[PDB]
Amino acid sequence: ATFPPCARKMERADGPATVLAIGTANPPNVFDQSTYPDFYFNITNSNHMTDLKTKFQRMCDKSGITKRYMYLNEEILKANPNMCAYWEKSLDVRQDMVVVEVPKLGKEAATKAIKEWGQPKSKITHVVFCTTSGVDMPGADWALTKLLGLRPSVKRLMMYQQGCFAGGTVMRVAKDLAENNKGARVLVVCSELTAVTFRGPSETHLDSLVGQALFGDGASAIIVGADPIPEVERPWFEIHYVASNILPDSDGAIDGHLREVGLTFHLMKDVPGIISKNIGTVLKDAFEKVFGVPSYNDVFWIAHPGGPAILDQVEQKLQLKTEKMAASRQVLSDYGNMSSACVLFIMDHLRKKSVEQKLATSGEGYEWGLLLGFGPGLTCETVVLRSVPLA
Amino acid sequence: ATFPPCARKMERADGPATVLAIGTANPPNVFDQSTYPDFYFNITNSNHMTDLKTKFQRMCDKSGITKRYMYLNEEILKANPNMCAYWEKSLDVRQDMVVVEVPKLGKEAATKAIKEWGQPKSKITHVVFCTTSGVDMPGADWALTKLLGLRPSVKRLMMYQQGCFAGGTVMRVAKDLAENNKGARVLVVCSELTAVTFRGPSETHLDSLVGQALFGDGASAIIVGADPIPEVERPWFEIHYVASNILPDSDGAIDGHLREVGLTFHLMKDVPGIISKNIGTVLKDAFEKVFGNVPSYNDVFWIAHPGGPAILDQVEQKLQLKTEKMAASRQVLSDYGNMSSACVLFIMDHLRKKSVEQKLATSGEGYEWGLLLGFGPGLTCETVVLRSVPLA
Ligand SMILES: CC(C)(COP(=O)(O)OP(=O)(O)OC[C@H]1O[C@@H](n2cnc3c(N)ncnc32)[C@H](O)[C@@H]1OP(=O)(O)O)[C@@H](O)C(=O)NCCC(=O)NCCS
Ligand SMILES: O=C1C[C@@H](c2ccc(O)cc2)Oc2cc(O)cc(O)c21
Ligand SMILES: O=C1C[C@@H](c2ccc(O)cc2)Oc2cc(O)cc(O)c21
Numbered sequence: 001a002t003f004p005p006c007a008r009k010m011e012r013a014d015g016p017a018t019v020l021a022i023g024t025a026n027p028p029n030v031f032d033q034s035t036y037p038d039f040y041f042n043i044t045n046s047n048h049m050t051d052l053k054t055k056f057q058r059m060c061d062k063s064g065i066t067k068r069y070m071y072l073n074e075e076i077l078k079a080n081p082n083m084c085a086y087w088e089k090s091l092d093v094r095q096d097m098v099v100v101e102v103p104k105l106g107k108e109a110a111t112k113a114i115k116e117w118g119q120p121k122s123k124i125t126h127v128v129f130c131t132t133s134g135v136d137m138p139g140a141d142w143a144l145t146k147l148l149g150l151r152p153s154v155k156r157l158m159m160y161q162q163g164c165f166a167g168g169t170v171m172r173v174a175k176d177l178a179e180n181n182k183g184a185r186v187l188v189v190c191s192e193l194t195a196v197t198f199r200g201p202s203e204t205h206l207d208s209l210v211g212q213a214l215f216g217d218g219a220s221a222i223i224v225g226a227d228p229i230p231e232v233e234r235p236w237f238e239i240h241y242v243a244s245n246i247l248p249d250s251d252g253a254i255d256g257h258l259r260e261v262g263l264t265f266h267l268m269k270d271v272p273g274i275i276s277k278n279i280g281t282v283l284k285d286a287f288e289k290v291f292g293v294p295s296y297n298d299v300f301w302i303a304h305p306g307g308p309a310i311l312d313q314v315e316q317k318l319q320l321k322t323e324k325m326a327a328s329r330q331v332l333s334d335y336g337n338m339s340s341a342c343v344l345f346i347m348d349h350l351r352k353k354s355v356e357q358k359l360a361t362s363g364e365g366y367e368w369g370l371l372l373g374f375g376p377g378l379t380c381e382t383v384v385l386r387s388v389p390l391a
Numbered sequence: 392a393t394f395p396p397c398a399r400k401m402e403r404a405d406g407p408a409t410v411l412a413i414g415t416a417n418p419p420n421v422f423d424q425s426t427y428p429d430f431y432f433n434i435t436n437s438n439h440m441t442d443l444k445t446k447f448q449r450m451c452d453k454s455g456i457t458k459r460y461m462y463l464n465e466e467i468l469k470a471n472p473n474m475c476a477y478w479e480k481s482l483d484v485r486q487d488m489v490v491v492e493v494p495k496l497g498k499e500a501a502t503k504a505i506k507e508w509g510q511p512k513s514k515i516t517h518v519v520f521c522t523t524s525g526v527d528m529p530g531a532d533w534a535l536t537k538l539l540g541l542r543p544s545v546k547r548l549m550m551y552q553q554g555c556f557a558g559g560t561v562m563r564v565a566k567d568l569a570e571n572n573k574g575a576r577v578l579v580v581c582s583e584l585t586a587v588t589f590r591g592p593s594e595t596h597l598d599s600l601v602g603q604a605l606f607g608d609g610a611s612a613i614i615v616g617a618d619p620i621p622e623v624e625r626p627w628f629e630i631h632y633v634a635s636n637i638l639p640d641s642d643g644a645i646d647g648h649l650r651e652v653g654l655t656f657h658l659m660k661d662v663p664g665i666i667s668k669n670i671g672t673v674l675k676d677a678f679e680k681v682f683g684n685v686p687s688y689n690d691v692f693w694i695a696h697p698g699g700p701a702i703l704d705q706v707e708q709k710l711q712l713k714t715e716k717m718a719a720s721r722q723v724l725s726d727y728g729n730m731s732s733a734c735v736l737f738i739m740d741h742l743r744k745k746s747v748e749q750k751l752a753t754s755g756e757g758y759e760w761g762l763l764l765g766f767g768p769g770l771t772c773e774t775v776v777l778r779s780v781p782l783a
Contacts, residue, residue, distance in 0.1 A: 135552040137647035152637035160551040161526040180571040246543040256528030376529040
């Protein structure tokens, strides 16, 4: 039923896929969260909706967010009344922005990672581009290739309308790309901008208002490869296990639609409840596979900060000690919810802080760790990581 | 710099990624190409555009297409005048159709693939869903998973807004999922519906008119795995080499923009020209990596994305292929039109079946080796080197 087998025509690698560099970028406009409700109701000309703004100030005060970064600013929003409305035909001006600026922010994040990596751009064999912010043909993967001047034969994978869990997905994608191809070096870019999602307030769409309180802009970039070249490339985290779960009883929990008015956000179930009710089973299953067993307090944690109640309720249900989510909270406070890019920001802070505090390893002390993405399905992406030792 | 190595935690497979099953599906409405211009100019209130209709009749006549299948029909279009115009805000009505109908049609093709495969669907470990028709959150990958009742823990990969080259991308994607994961069985689904792209004619955007003559609807699905179970699973094609290339001097050749008027289609360079000048360089590099320092193009089987007949004609001319090589590619174009990322899988299925039918030596018309090519925006050329299986 088969011709006689031949050796793998495209050689594969032997070690684990390894993070060799991380770079991050954010748009230049900074928004204090504690005064953001004033700005938001000013720029949306909705100061007559008194009770709604009180509701929004509470949302912002309870977000665990201190500041956010956005491509949008006061000048740009005055120029587009249709994006300041809650529900006006927009998509076209929104697309005109994000199809340009999402590859641009990704390039700034990627240039940093390429620079830290140290190798020539020409060594990049694969490009994985992940966003939730607009679509186009050719995609932001093609645009990033041109902007960076990678070789025209890079193998690309364009991930559009992904959502918050895709920071975990890209790790699972790059794992197989890196491990199945000897010498493959994968450029992974997550890049998100709220220009598709910013909109005016409505008294009957309070979940849309939660989104206005939480979503920020940012781009993160990693170089993934297996078999790092000793004393030339420098490892930081190893990918050893990945898993995907549609959580029980979660149908319709989070929906997002791309419409003539832009991208709309819909909350319809207790998202922190469903995650925290089911996270025990998922991680226990992963740990049996990887180990078959360290404590949850003895591994490092990169958890997507969908919002603070997620991190809070996982922490309680699993009875974690409060430093386990500290790095994930650090990014949420410093940046807000940047959809897919969040976890890669958290990974970078983890390593930087572990180095700077002169700890044993890249993951704040521990040999093993977790990276968790959450979003729409309701989808939980699971990554078991190993760190590297340090001085 | 590293912790002590440990054995790979997730076992890998050893053989090549193999196609184990193919199924396809189309919407139920058939449109004869020869009289399609009469239907199209009438439904878009364009009967007065007398010379434009004569041009469109020529496009249809020279299209190499006999018929297409479409989810759209007469009743659906009359219910949506904003779609029968050239440039009205529609995207919402277009999304309402395709976010439901794309996973639906893919479900149809996937059930056929799974039935041929013969294994329990619970043994599917990965889902790759590929489309250029609509986007949604959660995606068509999620909806397909629910419709089929696959395991809740499948590893899903959602590929939106891909374009015509993506039939080769999913093969490339599926190669690494299957090979790096022992026991992985990947369901790959490409599902395309013209409801995103249909629009009335304009005398000044004849490239938009070109799309209206060529694009059809369809979905195709494959089961891809490595290390097949002897006597249980049946290999049909192996994936041995994958390559990707942005062709030189091709910026702007094919653009597609998702707007408030829906998906718009633009052609601003000689696309069959650019592909045919460069395909030799592309295929020569792939063959040198597979075979060293090498069969002739006439001695392999061809699965070429039929973006239009001029592409197949100009690759046939410049590479001096005998005319039989593109025949399978042209048969699918004839019977279905250009189904974006779904076509090549339709051509793959057609190839195997007529090889079995005519009792040829292999599943790729008696050749051992062959190509699957996808052409699209970028200009992106995706290259796959396949091996067939022998036949009794
Ligand atoms: C060329 C093709 C569009 C139609 O067949 P064709 O026989 O070449 O048409 P001919 O050139 O013989 O006929 C000429 C008329 O057709 C129309 N036409 C054909 N291709 C056209 C194009 N790219 N743009 C505009 N008009 C076109 C024109 O109106 C032309 O007359 P013009 O002088 O007014 O432009 C088709 O076979 C093809 O493959 N074209 C490009 C491939 C493609 O479309 N790829 C889709 C990719 S995802
Ligand atoms: O509606 C949006 C906005 C989007 C987004 C966030 C940050 C950013 O920078 C750009 C886009 O994030 C989301 C993530 C989801 O899981 C579901 C959603 O509906 C959305
Ligand atoms: O504009 C379209 C239509 C789309 C399409 C075709 C058939 C179908 O059934 C659904 C969508 O295919 C494309 C493929 C491209 O590379 C570029 C494009 O602009 C387009």
